[PDB]
Coordinates of C-alpha atoms in Angstrom, one line a residue:
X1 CA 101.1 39.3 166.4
X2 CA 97.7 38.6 167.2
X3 CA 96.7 42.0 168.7
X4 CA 93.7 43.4 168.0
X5 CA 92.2 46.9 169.5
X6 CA 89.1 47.5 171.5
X7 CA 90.8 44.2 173.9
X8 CA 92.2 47.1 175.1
X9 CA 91.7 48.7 178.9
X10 CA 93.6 50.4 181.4
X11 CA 93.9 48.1 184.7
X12 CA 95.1 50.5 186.4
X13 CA 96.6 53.8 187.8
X14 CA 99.1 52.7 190.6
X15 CA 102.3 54.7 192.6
X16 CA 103.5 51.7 195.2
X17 CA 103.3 48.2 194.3
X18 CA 101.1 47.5 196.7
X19 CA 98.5 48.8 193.7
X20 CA 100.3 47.2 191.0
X21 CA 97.9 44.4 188.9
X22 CA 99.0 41.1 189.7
X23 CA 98.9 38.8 186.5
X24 CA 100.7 36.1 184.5
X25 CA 101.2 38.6 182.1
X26 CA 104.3 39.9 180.3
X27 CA 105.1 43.8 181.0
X28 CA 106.6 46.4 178.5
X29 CA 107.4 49.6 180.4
X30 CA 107.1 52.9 177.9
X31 CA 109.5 55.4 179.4
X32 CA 110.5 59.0 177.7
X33 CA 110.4 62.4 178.3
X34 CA 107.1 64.2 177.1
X35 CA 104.1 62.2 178.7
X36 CA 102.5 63.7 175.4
X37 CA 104.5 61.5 172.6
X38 CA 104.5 58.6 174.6
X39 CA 100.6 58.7 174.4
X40 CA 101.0 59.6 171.2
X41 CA 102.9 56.6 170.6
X42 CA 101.1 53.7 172.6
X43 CA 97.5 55.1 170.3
X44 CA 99.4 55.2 167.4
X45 CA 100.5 51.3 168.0
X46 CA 97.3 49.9 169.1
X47 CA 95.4 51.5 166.5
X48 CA 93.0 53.9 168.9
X49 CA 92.9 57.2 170.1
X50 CA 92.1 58.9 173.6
X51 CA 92.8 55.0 174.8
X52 CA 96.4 56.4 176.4
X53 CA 95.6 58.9 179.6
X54 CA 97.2 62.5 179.4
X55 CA 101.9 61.5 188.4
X56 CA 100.9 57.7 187.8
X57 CA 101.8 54.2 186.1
X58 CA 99.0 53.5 183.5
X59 CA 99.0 49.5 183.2
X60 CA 97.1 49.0 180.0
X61 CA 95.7 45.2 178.6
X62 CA 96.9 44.2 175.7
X63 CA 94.2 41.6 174.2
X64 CA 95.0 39.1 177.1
X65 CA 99.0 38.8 175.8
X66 CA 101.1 41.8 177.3
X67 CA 100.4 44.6 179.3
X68 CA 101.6 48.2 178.5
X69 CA 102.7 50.1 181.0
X70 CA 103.3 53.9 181.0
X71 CA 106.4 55.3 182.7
X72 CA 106.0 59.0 184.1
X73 CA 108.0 61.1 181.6
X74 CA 111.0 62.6 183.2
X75 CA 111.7 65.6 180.9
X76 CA 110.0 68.2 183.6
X77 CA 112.2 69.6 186.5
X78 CA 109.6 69.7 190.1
X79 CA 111.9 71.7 192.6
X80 CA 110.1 70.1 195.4
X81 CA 112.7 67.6 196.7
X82 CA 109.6 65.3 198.5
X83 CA 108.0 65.6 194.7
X84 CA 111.4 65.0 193.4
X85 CA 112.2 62.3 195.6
X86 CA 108.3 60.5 195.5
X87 CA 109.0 60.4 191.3
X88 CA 112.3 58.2 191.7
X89 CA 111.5 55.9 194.2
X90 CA 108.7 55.4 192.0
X91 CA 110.4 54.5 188.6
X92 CA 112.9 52.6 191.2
X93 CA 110.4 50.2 192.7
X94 CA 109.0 49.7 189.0
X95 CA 112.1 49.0 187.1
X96 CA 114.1 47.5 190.6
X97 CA 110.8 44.6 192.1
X98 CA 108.4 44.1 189.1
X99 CA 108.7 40.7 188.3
X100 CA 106.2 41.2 184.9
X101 CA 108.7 43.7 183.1
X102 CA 110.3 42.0 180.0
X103 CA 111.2 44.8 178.1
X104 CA 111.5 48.8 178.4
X105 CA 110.6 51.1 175.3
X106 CA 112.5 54.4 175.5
X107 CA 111.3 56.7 172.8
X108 CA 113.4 59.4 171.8
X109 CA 112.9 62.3 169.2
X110 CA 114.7 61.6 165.9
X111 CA 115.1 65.7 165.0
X112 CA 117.4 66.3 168.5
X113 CA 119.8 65.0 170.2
X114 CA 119.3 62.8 173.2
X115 CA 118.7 65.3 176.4
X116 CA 121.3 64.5 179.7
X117 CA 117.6 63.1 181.1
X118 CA 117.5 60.5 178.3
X119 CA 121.2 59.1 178.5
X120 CA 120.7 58.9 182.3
X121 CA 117.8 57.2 182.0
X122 CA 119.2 54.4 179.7
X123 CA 122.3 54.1 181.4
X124 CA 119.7 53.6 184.9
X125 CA 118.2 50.3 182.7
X126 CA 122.1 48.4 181.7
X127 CA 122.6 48.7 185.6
X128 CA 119.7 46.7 185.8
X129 CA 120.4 45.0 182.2
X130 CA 116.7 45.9 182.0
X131 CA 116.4 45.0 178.0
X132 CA 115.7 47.9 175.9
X133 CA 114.7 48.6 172.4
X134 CA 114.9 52.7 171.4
X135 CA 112.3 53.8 169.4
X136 CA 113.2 57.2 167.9
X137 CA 109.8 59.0 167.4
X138 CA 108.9 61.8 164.7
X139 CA 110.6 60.3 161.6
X140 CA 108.7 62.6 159.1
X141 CA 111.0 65.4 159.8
X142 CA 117.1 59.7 159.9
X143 CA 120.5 57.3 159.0
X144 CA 123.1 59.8 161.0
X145 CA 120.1 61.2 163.2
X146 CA 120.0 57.5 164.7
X147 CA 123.5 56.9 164.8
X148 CA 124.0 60.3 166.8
X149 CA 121.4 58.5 169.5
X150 CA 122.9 55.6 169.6
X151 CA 126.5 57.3 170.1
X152 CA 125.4 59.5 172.9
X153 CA 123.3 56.7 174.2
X154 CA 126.3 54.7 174.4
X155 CA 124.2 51.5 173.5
X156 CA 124.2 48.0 174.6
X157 CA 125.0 45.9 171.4
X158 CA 122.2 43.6 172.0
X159 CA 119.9 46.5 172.2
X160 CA 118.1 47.4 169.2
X161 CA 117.1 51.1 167.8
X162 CA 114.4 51.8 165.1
X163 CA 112.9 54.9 163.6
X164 CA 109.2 55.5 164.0
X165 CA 106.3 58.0 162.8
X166 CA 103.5 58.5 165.4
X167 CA 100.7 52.8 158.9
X168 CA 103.8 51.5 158.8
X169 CA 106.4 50.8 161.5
X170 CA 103.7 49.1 163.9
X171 CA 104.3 45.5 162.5
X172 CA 108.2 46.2 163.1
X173 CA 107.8 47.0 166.6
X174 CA 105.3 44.1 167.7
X175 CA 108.0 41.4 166.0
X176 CA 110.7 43.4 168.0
X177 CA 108.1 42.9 171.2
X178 CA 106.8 39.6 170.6
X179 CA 110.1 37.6 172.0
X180 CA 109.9 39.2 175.5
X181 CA 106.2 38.3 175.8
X182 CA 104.6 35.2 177.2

């Protein structure tokens, strides 16, 4: 679509929704378990890097036509049960009030299996029937690699799953995108 980099800024960094953006804007929520390939990911579709940061969610501007928000990853145990607790009232109030949020982008790695965090995490969006489009990341390094996801996912049949090397696959993913946005 037409989406061109250097339109592109983070808003904000917000924890309550008191210090979410308010805009007429569609919201895609990028949710995974490294905050590392997720960053990874949102550069490598943009067509930037050091754009993406790394606790927060990053609400990035698309060119004026979606925003981009990025999820805390949820792959690192905290012990603290207030830390604990502060991180899922957090996703909770995202996912649970934002009006914006379209569409959720989980991205897991092609060369594993899914982790327990991942299939709970998926299963948390159909309660929801948050839609959800599974990107699985790292493709260099596929046909039974995705259907072993999408088994242990347990997917919605409306929801797609594509592989994707962090060039190529960026066209794919904005057409997959470009329905949920306004």
């Amino acid at each position: 679509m037409k989406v061109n980099p250097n339109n592109i800024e983070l808003i904000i960094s917000a924890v309550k929704e008191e210090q979410y953006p308010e805009t007429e804007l569609s919201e895609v929520a990028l949710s995974g378990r490294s905050n590392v390939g997720k960053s990874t990911f949102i550069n490598s579709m943009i067509g930037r890097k050091n754009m993406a940061r790394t606790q927060t969610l990053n609400f990035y501007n698309i060119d004026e036509q979606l925003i981009f928000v990025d999820v805390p990853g949820y792959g690192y145990a905290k012990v603290s049960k207030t830390q604990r607790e502060k991180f899922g009232k957090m996703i909770e109030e995202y996912i649970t009030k934002r009006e914006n949020l379209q569409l959720v982008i989980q991205l897991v790695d092609l060369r594993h299996d899914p982790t327990q965090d991942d299939i709970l995490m998926y299963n948390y969006l159909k309660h929801f029937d948050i839609p959800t489009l599974v990107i699985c990341t790292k493709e260099d390094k596929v046909q039974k690699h995705i259907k072993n996801i999408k088994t242990q996912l347990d997917m919605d049949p409306d929801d797609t799953i594509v592989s994707y090397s962090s060039n190529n696959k960026q066209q794919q993913i904005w057409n997959l995108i470009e329905p949920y946005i306004s």
